[PDB]
């Protein structure tokens, strides 16, 4: 089950 | 830029006349833009390449297999061409290495 | 040791076609359960275990949605990165992530991580504490700040705290029979004389499960590691491995020499010789 949230660049 | 590393097995000790897995690994590439041929007497077989995955260290690795019977006569290698090297890398498949 | 889940992303920029491509798979241990590639037309998460098959297609469309969300905002970082580190369009980049949860004894989180790479050298990592992050350069430290910004490590922390282990331990109950069995090597010790000066002998570990295994050759209870080839463990084809370890030995003296062979899946370490 992936993550939902999306690291930052 | 790392180069890959190549390894070409059977899956299982190579019996002539016995239905048997060619495989050819290759490991620890970067970048991971590469070309894997499976070759059977030098010609491209029709082999199915694994996903794009990575190790630890972020270098990159594929299998690349097919099903093959050997015998006395037939000669297999494993061809990779990649950025690191000038000439493509050629393993020849030995039963035993 | 310990059962773990993984996700490895990685987005490559394609300067000729003015895109890029986004791969990812998932791993349970040393197994493949997933994998999304954006170009694949009409692209979805797909099954690459048998175990995972049986998930509903409310599950597929979750994991499919993340995928086409990651691989659209990866082909604007690929972009970001190049600009911090002022490099051309003419140029293919790559960025990789790694993240997961090992599972500690209790049924909790044991160890997290989530880790990201630039051209295959390190960029982020989140710290053991899962409230920080390190940087490993001047532009990984702007990427760090936008995270702080955002309280981002306690999203992390959260996902591998709580969802991360959820799904393992429901993964390893969907595929028992595969995940949590152990399958021994089945080995066996060849005879090469390669040369005049010596004799080759080979121990050979195959079809074993999982990935870790010791191989040793030894001689009058003298280890012979300094002197025996160790090839890279590969995989089988079929989701087991194979090893092998050579060493050369004077000509009349092999059965003087045994190859040691410890797995998780043996009732006690084994000892071979040849003929």
Known sequence: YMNCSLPTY | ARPPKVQVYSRHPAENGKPNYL????????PPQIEIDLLKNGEKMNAEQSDLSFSKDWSFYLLVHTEFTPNAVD???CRVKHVTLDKPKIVKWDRDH | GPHSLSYFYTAVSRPDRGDSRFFIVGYVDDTQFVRFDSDAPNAKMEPRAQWIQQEGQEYWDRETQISKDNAQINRVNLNTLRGYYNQSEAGSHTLQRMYGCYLGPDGLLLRGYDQDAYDGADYIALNEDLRSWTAADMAAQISK???EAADEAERMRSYLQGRCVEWLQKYLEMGKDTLQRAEPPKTHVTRHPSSDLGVTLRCWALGFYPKEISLSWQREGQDQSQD????????????????????????????????????????????????
């Open chain 2, 75 to 77: 000669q297999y290698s």
């Open chain 2, 23 to 30: 495989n050819c690994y290759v490991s620890g590439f970067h």
């Open chain 3, 228 to 275: 025996m080839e160790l090839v890279e463990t590969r995989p089988s084809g079929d989701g087991t491995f194979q090893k092998w370890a050579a060493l050369v030995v004077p000509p009349g003296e092999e059965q003087s020499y045994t190859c040691h062979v410890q797995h998780e899946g043996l009732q006690e370490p084994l000892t071979l010789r040849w003929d």
């Open chain 3, 145 to 147: 700040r936008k995270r």
